[PDB]
Nucleic acid binder design. Structure first.
Ligand SMILES: CN[C@@H]1[C@@H](O)[C@@H](O[C@@H]2[C@@H](O)[C@H](O[C@H]3O[C@H](CN)CC[C@H]3N)[C@@H](N)C[C@H]2N)OC[C@]1(C)O
Ligand SMILES: [Mg+2]
Ligand SMILES: [Mg+2]
Ligand SMILES: [Mg+2]
Ligand SMILES: [Mg+2]
Ligand SMILES: [Mg+2]
Ligand SMILES: [Mg+2]
Ligand SMILES: [Mg+2]
Ligand SMILES: [Mg+2]
Ligand SMILES: [Mg+2]
Ligand SMILES: [Mg+2]
Ligand SMILES: [Mg+2]
Ligand SMILES: [Mg+2]
Ligand SMILES: [Mg+2]
Ligand SMILES: [Mg+2]
Ligand SMILES: [Mg+2]
Ligand SMILES: [Mg+2]
Ligand SMILES: [Mg+2]
Ligand SMILES: [Mg+2]
Ligand SMILES: [Mg+2]
Ligand SMILES: [Mg+2]
Ligand SMILES: [Mg+2]
Ligand SMILES: [Mg+2]
Ligand SMILES: [Mg+2]
Ligand SMILES: [Mg+2]
Ligand SMILES: [Mg+2]
Ligand SMILES: [Mg+2]
Ligand SMILES: [Mg+2]
Ligand SMILES: [Mg+2]
Ligand SMILES: [Mg+2]
Ligand SMILES: [Mg+2]
Ligand SMILES: [Mg+2]
Ligand SMILES: [Mg+2]
Ligand SMILES: [Mg+2]
Ligand SMILES: [Mg+2]
Ligand SMILES: [Mg+2]
Ligand SMILES: [Mg+2]
Ligand SMILES: [Mg+2]
Ligand SMILES: [Mg+2]
Ligand SMILES: [Mg+2]
Ligand SMILES: [Mg+2]
Ligand SMILES: [Mg+2]
Ligand SMILES: [Mg+2]
Ligand SMILES: [Mg+2]
Ligand SMILES: [Mg+2]
Ligand SMILES: [Mg+2]
Ligand SMILES: [Mg+2]
Ligand SMILES: [Mg+2]
Ligand SMILES: [Mg+2]
Ligand SMILES: [Mg+2]
Ligand SMILES: [Mg+2]
Ligand SMILES: [Mg+2]
Ligand SMILES: [Mg+2]
Ligand SMILES: [Mg+2]
Ligand SMILES: [Mg+2]
Ligand SMILES: [Mg+2]
Ligand SMILES: [Mg+2]
Lengths: 155, 188, 260, 167
RNA sequence: GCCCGUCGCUAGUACCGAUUGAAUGGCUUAGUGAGGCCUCAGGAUCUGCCAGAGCGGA
RNA sequence: GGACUUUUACUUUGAAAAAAUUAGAGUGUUCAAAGCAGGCGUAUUGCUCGAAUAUAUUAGCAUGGAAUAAUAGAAUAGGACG
RNA sequence: UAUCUGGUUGAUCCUGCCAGUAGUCAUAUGCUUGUCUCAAAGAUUAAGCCAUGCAUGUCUAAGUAUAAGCAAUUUAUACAGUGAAACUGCGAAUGGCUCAUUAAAUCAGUUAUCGUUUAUUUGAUAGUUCACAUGGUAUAACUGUGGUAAUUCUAGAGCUAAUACAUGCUUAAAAUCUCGACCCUUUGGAAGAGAUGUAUUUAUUAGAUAAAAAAUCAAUGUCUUCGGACUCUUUGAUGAUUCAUAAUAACUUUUCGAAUCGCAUGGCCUUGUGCUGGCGAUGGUUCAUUCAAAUUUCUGCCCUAUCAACUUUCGAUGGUAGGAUAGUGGCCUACCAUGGUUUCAACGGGUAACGGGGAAUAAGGGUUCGAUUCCGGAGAGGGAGCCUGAGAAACGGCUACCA
RNA sequence: GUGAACAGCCUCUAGUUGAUAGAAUAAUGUAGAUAAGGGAAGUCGGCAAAAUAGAUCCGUAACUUCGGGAUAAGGAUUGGC
């Protein structure tokens, strides 16, 4: 998703209070603000090198990561600039002294810093409410391939 | 009245939620100001915990900053040429945040040709002094320049007039003024 | 629930108050003030249950309305006033001076001081902020806002205070090896010496502690109140000085010396 | 018994919502509005009683009205109010110009009078002088406390430059 | 010896059943829609900056 | 402080944990259910011990463990180190 | 605190139930009832209905007293004692009661506010404003004349107050900015004029630190030991921010910056009722603190498939923008995307379902209950709507409907 | 031209204006209209009559030979610029 047009909305997309003076001629054009989210999390290169905009991007945006931090694997990429992860986990029934498989499906807004794919585990930091569903934000991507290369052409 | 509660609506699963308790005064919402131009008239909502807010409707004047000139002057608002949310706001010339207006340019033209003297478009002792200390910065931009002939400048409302009672904002400049310039005459 | 609650049922009352089940319905509700509801002593629980000077509540007001009581030099005529840690309660009759400080069992103590020691008190800086027009201000667990302080004062430190005016007369840093008071946690009331502090970016710094019997424990950084330098407390400690003998070692102290 | 409330422009009785600061309603709680029954403002045969104020006299005096005369209840209380009842400007010292009322307890006949409010008193200027006093006396003491800092930190920077010598 | 099913007397329970049956409680399309609130107006009379006049306030 | 780190289950320890209830120490309510009192002289001007402790578990946080059980890696090398 | 006994056969050992036995912080009932201490109690049915009474009022030396009130004597020709009424203020959002609703709701433990509001308490914080020996009316109580069968119903007329209503003066030093009459040709310098508290809205600049050095371009700071040269003055917090804080240009039906009250009355002359000054009350903006609030993270419920697909008429999932709110957020609105849940049981149905602390039963494991003394949530016949206020969607507040 | 249309209504080309006539406007008729409130009580019987009506969007039961029932039922909308 994202991945072109930068301007595609009827609204002109820009970072708040980051001003490019027209009279002062710059060869970089855009002056692009960022930070590092903290909590020992790398603000990735593409957040800086990128041309993108989104204000829900915890590195270039106005949302701050605090509270829980969660691991889980991506089951759905179908939404633009957000995704749903399945964090499974086991539940202990005291009577039977056993465990039963459970899961909870967490929608989380993926900044357009990351290329996320289905099957990739992802680390996710908690943030302020973003959409109806999403209280969490993609932070680190733990799987760069997930078998992608082992599928290969004939010879 | 209006309620911003999520107790209405539905589940994320798409389940109907039952009616639980009632509306509370703190889930509350109120009507749109739908602020307009002309004849300044403003009503004041008394909000949660004292905290007056200020309802703009009919404001004909507001303070607009020149982004790259580091100066700000209050002007007239001449209309609305664009708006990203609904086109009906441009037609009705309703004033909202991020609404694209036209302003005056004359308080900006009076000030530029004083601070500089370059007579957009188109003798005192210490005057020629600072006039000469200036320029080199007098180039401005063609796209702000050419506007000045018409006598109306493209501004953008940066405030929330129904909330704050004021209509303020900045002159469209650089990339924005470049972008709206497309949709402006690619719609008109 | 439509407003702030103005009562306290006497069960949900904090138990370090040590109030009997029957004999009433409600606790007194600590007023708003320097100290928090859960952690505080209202003068009524003090002038009545602790010090037994006033039998009624009726007597506690008939006392306080004579100006006799005062806290940190100010008179304090309100019955439910939320007195608490480090506070100095001075009766001008009886010429008694008390500092309100914790036992090892966790309650507040009735602990006298000199006419002198009464005139200063510690507080823990709860944050260091830069106020309006540049003035940095420091603020304390008891709610004192103090401006123009020493730049070497940081959060979690402690401060000596004048109580006549309010100025800072000294500041003790937070460094490994400082005498320390535990306010909060089960270890609340234990005392002294700070062997280590575990970082935990993301909150809740753990602090090891060893008293001098050479016993060791841990609490939250928030529960650590720096009282001074090793072996020297800046204020008068009470009997036992926050050690915690086990229930058997307190059983031998009682089953031997005092009385029979 | 329903009263007339002007402004309705009706011969008829209608019900309305009544608030603070309108007639026929005496609100009994803060913000209490109550629906009452108001009689219209236009006259009709239906009124048991009518209220009339005389704009001009007439060639015949009327027994209990033009013939007789009543005292006002209370005299001026506010200082300048006595001043502008009698027209004294600010010199004439309105104290002895207060109005006094008699009364008699079993031949003990006595006297009483207002307390002139917003009077200029020596006590009242002592406070005014005191207010301009505290405000300036406070003002400078904060400037000196500010200089105590500007000394404390600047002489902390002369400790930080002199420790570079230790390096 | 045990023992089965129809038939038949008595009592109880449930079922199916015309009545386009009935009642209770809860959601709901559509139609109508009190009321307060927001807003556009209005302006009984009453003031603002003794013939009279302008444009703001109640 | 920089630069990175395959991810799990489990088990240790801890911090944070309302009272009342419960288990339970103390105290002779005259016994007792209780209650959290009281107990000592110099009983005409005071002294003084108390109001303990434990339980709290599934989840959350912090920590020692690396067995059992999952999980990922180099094979059309698009491999590892410098 | 790990226990069985009786009942199928002619007898038998089994299966398996019935019955016996035991306790119940479990109700009911019946017989019987002397004493001390302790004390549950119209929850279960019907959150069904209600006659009457009562359950929320409130004043200090200290906001307003001319009661035609009482009372003094005792100093008060302005007032002063005491003080009904009325204005002003605050409270009335606590308490108390009940469990109707409610099954991802509430709740519990655990988080979040870098997502917000907060009277009050506590601690700080105000020289800057254009008659100042202190500026204006407009009113209750009251007085009198009235209407009604009828109520805490009120009308007309005549008074009079304020910490109510509404206005409106004030104060040091210095400094940095802009403009700038003149003379001046030089790197050029200038009297004098305005602006500058705080709050509001906007935009722009600072808010550094990741180890070291160089040419150029425009503007332009501070020193000349006259060619040139040049800072080790700012450096706050957090895991992390556009944070605290600061500065520049303007903006505003300009927020605030005392027109207030109780006690005492003491200095200081150049003797003007001159100029000062004590102990504290009530206030006042901002910040903190506390009392709270509202959302909020992870994980956790009973029966049911004779409920398998659910959600998106008309928000369902997400994006962008605005509106709205105290604030975040499909909270609402425009355009846009086609999404979100489920056999790891969604969705639906039921609950004689408020949830938790806890309760009973005492090998362990379990089973069963919790309306109910504590916490949390809901509601005041049913629904909605709203005024007042810091705080209510209040019901011993109002408005409407249905009953 | 309107319109789904060779419907109806109006028109062009063409073709008629032919059917005893005048004057009145009672009853009773033939043919067409409308009636307050009630709503089949009229009647062998709703006979007659009234109500319905097009399109677009929403919604649709028993039952069934699964093809149907179905325009089921029941709704909302409609001009001009
Ligand atoms: C209908 N006549 C009877 C019928 O009534 C029934 O009777 C028995 C009876 O014979 C048994 O009892 C007999 O045999 C026992 C042998 N130990 C002793 C007691 C004796 N009465 C009972 N225990 C049970 C009844 N249901 O079972 C047997 C039968 C012949 O069918
Ligand atoms: Mg405020
Ligand atoms: Mg921390
Ligand atoms: Mg934190
Ligand atoms: Mg037979
Ligand atoms: Mg049946
Ligand atoms: Mg409807
Ligand atoms: Mg448990
Ligand atoms: Mg029994
Ligand atoms: Mg007997
Ligand atoms: Mg009942
Ligand atoms: Mg009832
Ligand atoms: Mg008095
Ligand atoms: Mg009152
Ligand atoms: Mg309550
Ligand atoms: Mg219920
Ligand atoms: Mg204060
Ligand atoms: Mg006031
Ligand atoms: Mg950094
Ligand atoms: Mg900002
Ligand atoms: Mg800021
Ligand atoms: Mg007064
Ligand atoms: Mg969105
Ligand atoms: Mg919001
Ligand atoms: Mg129920
Ligand atoms: Mg239950
Ligand atoms: Mg349990
Ligand atoms: Mg319960
Ligand atoms: Mg009860
Ligand atoms: Mg309620
Ligand atoms: Mg209903
Ligand atoms: Mg209902
Ligand atoms: Mg209600
Ligand atoms: Mg009631
Ligand atoms: Mg109530
Ligand atoms: Mg009905
Ligand atoms: Mg009913
Ligand atoms: Mg056609
Ligand atoms: Mg045709
Ligand atoms: Mg012919
Ligand atoms: Mg014929
Ligand atoms: Mg004829
Ligand atoms: Mg004739
Ligand atoms: Mg005829
Ligand atoms: Mg007709
Ligand atoms: Mg009809
Ligand atoms: Mg009809
Ligand atoms: Mg009908
Ligand atoms: Mg018929
Ligand atoms: Mg019929
Ligand atoms: Mg018939
Ligand atoms: Mg018949
Ligand atoms: Mg027939
Ligand atoms: Mg027919
Ligand atoms: Mg019809
Ligand atoms: Mg139809
Ligand atoms: Mg038309």
């Amino acid at each position: 998703s994202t991945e072109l047009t930068v301007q595609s909305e009827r609204a002109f997309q820009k970072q708040p209070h980051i001003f490019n003076n027209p009279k002062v001629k710059t060869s970089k054009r855009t002056k692009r603000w960022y930070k590092n989210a903290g909590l020992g999390f790398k603000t990735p290169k593409t957040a800086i090198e990128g041309s993108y905009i989104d204000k829900k991007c915890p590195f270039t945006g106005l949302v701050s990561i605090r509270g829980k931090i969660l691991t889980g694997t991506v089951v759905s990429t179908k939404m633009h600039r957000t995704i749903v992860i399945r964090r499974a986990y086991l539940h202990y029934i005291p009577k039977y002294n056993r465990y039963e498989k459970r899961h909870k499906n967490v929608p989380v807004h993926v900044s357009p810093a990351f290329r996320v794919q289905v099957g990739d585990i992802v680390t996710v930091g908690q943030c302020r409410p973003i959409s109806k569903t999403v209280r969490f934000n993609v932070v680190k991507v733990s799987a760069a391939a997930g078998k992608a290369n082992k599928q290969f052409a004939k010879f | 009245g209006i309620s911003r509660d999520s107790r209405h609506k539905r589940s994320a699963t798409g389940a109907k939620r039952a009616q639980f308790r009632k509306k509370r005064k703190f889930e509350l919402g109120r009507q749109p100001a739908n602020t307009k131009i002309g004849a300044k008239r403003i009503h004041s909502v008394r909000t949660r915990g004292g905290n007056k807010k200020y309802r703009a409707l009919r404001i004909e004047t507001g303070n607009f900053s020149w982004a790259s000139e580091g100066i700000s002057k209050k002007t007239r608002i001449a209309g609305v040429v664009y708006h990203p949310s609904n086109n009906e706001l441009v037609r009705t010339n309703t004033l909202t945040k991020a609404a694209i207006v036209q302003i005056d340019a004359t308080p900006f033209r009076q000030w530029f040709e004083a601070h500089y003297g370059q007579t957009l478009g188109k003798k005192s002792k210490n005057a020629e002094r600072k006039w000469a200390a200036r320029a080199a910065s007098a180039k401005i931009e063609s796209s702000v320049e050419s506007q000045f002939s018409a006598g109306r400048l493209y501004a953008c409302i940066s405030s929330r007039p129904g909330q704050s009672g004021r209509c303020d904002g900045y002159i469209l400049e650089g990339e924005e003024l470049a972008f709206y310039l497309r949709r402006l005459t690619a719609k008109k | 629930a439509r407003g702030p609650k103005k009562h306290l049922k006497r069960l949900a009352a904090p138990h370090h108050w040590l109030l009997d089940k029957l004999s009433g319905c409600y606790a007194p509700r600590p007023s708003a003030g320097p100290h928090k509801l859960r952690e505080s002593l209202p003068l009524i629980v003090f002038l009545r249950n602790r010090l037994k000077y006033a039998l009624n509540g009726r007597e506690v007001k008939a006392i306080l309305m004579q100006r006799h009581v005062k806290v940190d030099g100010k008179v304090r005529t309100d019955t439910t006033y939320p007195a608490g840690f480090m506070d100095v309660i001075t009766l001008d009759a009886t010429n008694e001076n008390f500092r309100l400080v914790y036992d090892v069992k966790g309650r507040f103590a009735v602990h006298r001081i000199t006419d002198e020691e009464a005139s200063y008190k510690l507080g823990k800086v709860k944050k260091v902020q830069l106020g309006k027009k540049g003035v940095p201000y420091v603020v304390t667990h008891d709610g004192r806002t103090i401006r123009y302080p020493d730049p070497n004062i940081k959060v979690n430190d402690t401060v000596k205070i004048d109580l006549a005016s309010g100025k800072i007369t000294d500041f003790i840093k937070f460094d490994a090896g400082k005498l320390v008071y535990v306010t909060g946690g089960r270890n609340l009331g234990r005392i002294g010496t700070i062997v280590h502090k575990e970082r935990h970016d993301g909150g809740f710094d753990l602090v090891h502690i060893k008293d001098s019997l050479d016993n060791t424990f841990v609490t939250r950084l928030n529960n650590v109140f720096v009282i001074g330098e090793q072996g020297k407390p800046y204020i008068s400690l009470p009997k036992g000085k926050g050690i915690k003998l086990s229930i058997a070692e307190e059983r031998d102290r009682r089953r031997a010396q005092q009385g029979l | 018994g329903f009263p007339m409330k002007q402004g309705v422009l009706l011969p008829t009785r209608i019900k309305l919502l009544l608030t603070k600061n309108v007639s026929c309603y005496r609100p009994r709680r803060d913000g209490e509005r109550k629906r009452k029954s108001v009689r219209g403002a236009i006259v009709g045969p239906d009124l048991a009683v009518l209220a009339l104020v005389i704009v001009k006299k007439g060639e015949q005096e009327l027994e209990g009205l033009t013939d007789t005369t009543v005292p006002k209840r209370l005299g001026p209380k506010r200082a300048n109010n006595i001043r502008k009842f009698f027209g004294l400007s600010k010199e004439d010292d309105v104290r002895d110009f207060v109005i006094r009322r008699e009364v008699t307890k079993g031949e003990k006949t006595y006297t009483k009078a207002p307390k002139i409010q917003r009077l200029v008193t020596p006590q009242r200027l002592q406070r005014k002088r005191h207010q301009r006093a505290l405000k300036v006396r406070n003002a400078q003491a904060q400037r000196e406390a500010a200089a105590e800092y500007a000394q404390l930190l600047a002489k902390r920077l002369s400790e930080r430059k002199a420790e570079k010598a230790e390096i």
